[PDB]
Amino acid sequence: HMSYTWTGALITPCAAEESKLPINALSNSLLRHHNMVYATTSRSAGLRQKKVTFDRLQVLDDHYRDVLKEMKAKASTVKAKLLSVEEACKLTPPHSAKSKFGYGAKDVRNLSSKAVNHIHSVWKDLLEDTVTPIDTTIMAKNEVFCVQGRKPARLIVFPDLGVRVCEKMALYDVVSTLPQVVMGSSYGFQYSPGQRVEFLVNTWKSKKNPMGFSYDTRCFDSTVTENDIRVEESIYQCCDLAPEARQAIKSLTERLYIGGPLTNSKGQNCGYRRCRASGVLTTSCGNTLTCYLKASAACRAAKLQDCTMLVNGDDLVVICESAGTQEDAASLRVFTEAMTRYSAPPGDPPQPEYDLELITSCSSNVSVAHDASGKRVYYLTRDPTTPLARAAWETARHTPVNSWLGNIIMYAPTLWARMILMTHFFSILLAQEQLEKALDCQIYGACYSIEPLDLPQIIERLHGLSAFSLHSYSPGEINRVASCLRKLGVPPLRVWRHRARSVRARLLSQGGRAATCGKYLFNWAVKTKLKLTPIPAASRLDLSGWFVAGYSGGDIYHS
């Protein structure tokens, strides 16, 4: 029962790959220690292949079937609809991988006859044939990291453009609607960061003696079995669906989700997958359900008292009622034993935490600062090393995903996003006159095209106005940022405050939406602080399509 089999054909690139941080005139204003930053390339793919290739054994007990029955009872209340071809096409990202059959993502977006005719033919074939495995492409992802020594490239596996549009037709409503019905408040992808921090704090405060822990599954996608994927299909099929949608979903499950052949960029056969594909629509929903199913069942096994789970795909955090520190630790071993029997064994062994701030989930921890009134406010933050490593790369190279922008949006209230990322990138945008130019970033796996001038209103909506007023950050948080800057050779925060005053004056000069950016984003930079009030255009923002579901690998775009 192996996750993959390989033919020995190489995982090959589709363009030149850089591994060394590209340096330009702007690089040194952010980061001096250039040799610390690197991009993964397909040269390391063989190391990743070894890591993701193993045997899966699963033993499923009454706890598992008990939780599953209940999940299915909730799934049976969901009514999901088929998307039209037009609706599915309009969710396709403009720069999505072109089809092997002679059209691209813009042909799809424009509903071009050739595109739409192909999509119709893939759909018909899905309904007519429920056995023939569907071809996928396996690619090495190029991602930027700081050394620690160097990690191998991650692998993405995805079907052709035509199939991706059919997935949407069949499953977009389901993967968007089902998970919150099944899991309720435990489905993480429904929350803004403000909502998520609130849920975490409220949940913590709701226990008499809280204990909390995160669970890291080693290579979760490879731990996912044919059983797991058929189980997911059986949850989908509990929904009230049109007969045509039922067939499409059974077919995609048999032919695509369960497994299939892997083809490299040069068209050669690299092997065969029998685990979760990283690049399908159901990757996030399937991972979330399957992780929640397994963990709920393991919580029962361990007899964890008054558990609340929070699950984003394969990222899992649990907060419960402590039974004492020794009992807690023992319960955790049992928990991990159960997860392992279910095929989800750990990377790091989990550990019990008695302080919310010491838990990492979605790569983030709770911390505390103060608003203008002096009131405590909790916010989500993280070690800034990877964010700043990538910011350094994106200073000198244009990338398909601007991580700096997703980091500003999602970590707006943080010391490091406000002082460094905002200051640095607005300074660049000013200089090139690109404040109004829409950029793409990825939030919960979906692709959004966002104008930098819109950030204040986006930030108010996700975080509230306090994001623009926070101060007296904790010593532990100040210290971690200061350490990171010393590690990467980033100028100290006193330097960034100086530049921010400049960037702010520059933005104020321009008036309009630029001055709003100066006024709200950089109020921290001046001693005589302005009074920040709700931004009118914020209540006007269409944050529909934001924070409904997760869509990692799912080829979803919002305009």
Ligand X SMILES: CC(C)(C)[C@H]1C(O)=C(C2=NS(=O)(=O)c3c(CNS(C)(=O)=O)cccc32)C(=O)N1Cc1ccc(F)cc1
Instruction: Tell the smallest beta-carbon distance from residue 7 to ligand X (Å).
Output: 26
* Three-state SS at 129: coil
- Amino acid identity at 129: D
Which residues pair with residue 353 across a beta bridge? 212
Cβ contacts of residue 454 below 8 Å, gap of 6+? Answer: 513, 541
CB of 353 to ligand X, least distance (A): 18
Could you say whether residue 364 binds ligand X (CB under 6 A)?
yes
Q: Is position 196 an interface residue for ligand X (rule: CB under 6 A)?
A: yes
Which residues lie below 8 Å from residue 15, measured CB to CB, with a gap of 6+? Answer: none
Q: Looking at 96-104, 310-318, 526-534, 536-544, which segment touches ligand X (CB under 6 A)?
A: 310-318
Q: Quick check: 380 binds ligand X (CB under 6 A)?
A: yes
Nearest Cα to 394, choosing from 196, 143, 198, 213?
143
Token readout for 352 is 């019990």
Q: Are 53 and 336 in contact (CB under 8 A)?
A: no
| Ranges within 315-344 binding ligand X (CB under 6 A) | 315
Compute the distance between CA of residue 284 and CA of residue 411 in angstroms, rounded to an integer: 22
Helices marked H in 33-157: 45-52, 62-75, 85-90, 105-109, 113-128
Say how far residue 525 (Cα) sits from the centre of its chain: 31
Return the range that interacts with ligand X (CB under 6 A); candidates 36-44, 200-208, 255-263, 309-317.
309-317
Q: Which of 152, 179, 279, 406 touches ligand X by CB under 6 A?
A: 406
440 forms part of the interface with ligand X (CB under 6 A) = no
Query: Is 371 annotated as a binding-site member?
Result: no
d(CA 104, CA 96) in angstroms, rounded, equals: 8
- Indicate whether 410 belongs to the interface with ligand X (CB under 6 A): yes
The answer to whether 3 and 222 are in contact (CB under 8 A) is yes
Q: Closest by alpha carbon to 288, among 215, 183, 359, 424?
A: 183
210 near ligand X (CB under 6 A):
no
**Gap between the Cα atoms of 554 and 536, Å rounded:** 33
Kindly identify the residues of this chain, within the stretch 131-150, that bind ligand X according to CB under 6 A.
Answer: none
Q: Of residues 96, 365, 367, 407, which one binds ligand X by CB under 6 A? A: 407
Choose one: 202-210, 320-328, 403-411, 534-542; the region binding ligand X (CB under 6 A). Answer: 403-411
Rank residues 414 and 457 by Cβ distance to ligand X and give the closer one. 414
Tell me whether residue 315 is annotated as binding: yes
Query: Which residue's C-beta sits nearest to ligand X?
Result: 313
Say whether residue 203 binds ligand X (CB under 6 A): no
Distance in Å, CB of 374 to ligand X, minimum? 25
**CA max distance for the chain:** 70
Interface with ligand X includes 232 (CB under 6 A)? no
Q: Which is nearer to ligand X, 329 or 438 (CB)?
A: 438
Q: Give the neighbor-by-neighbor strand order of the sheet with 136-140.
A: 4-6, 269-273, 260-263, 136-140, 155-158
499 membership: H or E segment, kind and range: helix 493-510
Q: Residue 165 CB: number of other CB atoms within 10 A?
A: 28
Among the listed ranges 5-13, 36-44, 55-63, 308-316, the one in contact with ligand X (CB under 6 A) is: 308-316
- Is position 413 an interface residue for ligand X (rule: CB under 6 A)? no
Q: Name the CA dihedral angle for 14, 18, 24, 26, rounded to a multiple of 10 degrees.
A: 90
Question: Judged by CB under 6 A, does residue 443 bind ligand X?
Answer: yes
Answer yes or no: are the C-beta atoms of 332 and 369 closer than 8 Å. no
Stretch that binds ligand X, among 5-13, 167-175, 320-328, 362-370 (CB under 6 A): 362-370
Q: Is 173 annotated for ligand binding?
A: no
Residue 44 is classified by DSSP as G
- Give the Cα separation of 338 and 294 in Å (integer): 8
Q: How far apart (Å, rounded) are the C-alpha atoms in residues 554 and 157?
A: 11
Minimum Å distance from CB 197 to ligand X?
A: 7
The answer to whether 165 contacts ligand X (rule: CB under 6 A) is no
CB of 287 to ligand X, least distance (A): 4
Taking the least distance from each CB to ligand X, the nearer of 335 and 444 is: 444
If DSSP codes are grouped into helix, strand and coil, which group holds residue 370? strand
CA 265 to chain centre: 25
| Residue with smaller CB distance to ligand X, 311 or 435 | 311
Q: How far is the CB of 410 from ligand X (least distance, A)?
A: 4
Residue with tokens 């997760």: 550
Q: Which stretch binds ligand X (CB under 6 A): 14-22, 117-125, 394-402, 437-445?
A: 437-445
Question: Which residue, 143 or 173, has its beta carbon nearer to ligand X?
Answer: 143
> CB 446 → ligand X: shortest distance, Å?
8
Structure tokens of 102? 């002679």
User: How many chain residues touch ligand X (CB under 6 A)?
Assistant: 21
**Closer residue to ligand X in complex, CB, 315/460:** 315
The CA angle 292-174-172, to the nearest 5 degrees, is 120
> Does 313 engage in binding with ligand X (CB under 6 A)?
yes
Q: Which amino acid is at 510?
A: Q
Taking residues 262 to 291 in sequence order and writing x for each that binds ligand X by CB under 6 A, - otherwise, the string is: ---------------------xx--x----
Closest approach, Cβ 381 to ligand X, in A, equals 9
Cβ-based nearer residue to ligand X, 21 or 443? 443
How many C-beta atoms surround the C-beta of residue 552 within 10 A? 18
Q: Which is nearer to ligand X, 137 or 381 (CB)?
A: 381
Alpha-helical (H) ranges within 324-441 are 325-341, 385-396, 403-410, 415-416, 423-432
Q: Is 202 a residue that touches ligand X (CB under 6 A)? A: no
Residue list for the binding site for Mg(2+): 216, 314-315
Residues that bind ligand X (CB under 6 A): 193, 196, 283-284, 287, 312-315, 362-364, 380, 406-407, 410, 443-445, 550, 552
Residue list for the binding site: 216, 314-315
